[PDB]
Amino acid sequence: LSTRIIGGIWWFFTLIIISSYTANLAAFLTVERMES
């Protein structure tokens, strides 16, 4: 319906947000643990 697409857009959008900063913080810690 017309409300199902709006819910999917907003859930997808906040999913994109949390996936983005999860990957960003995780790879930040990855490049951080590189230590010599």
Partner: peptide, 15 residues
Amino acid sequence: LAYLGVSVVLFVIAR
């Protein structure tokens, strides 16, 4: 395509 597949199923299903 996979997301709107359920949408057109519900369009053809509901009607």
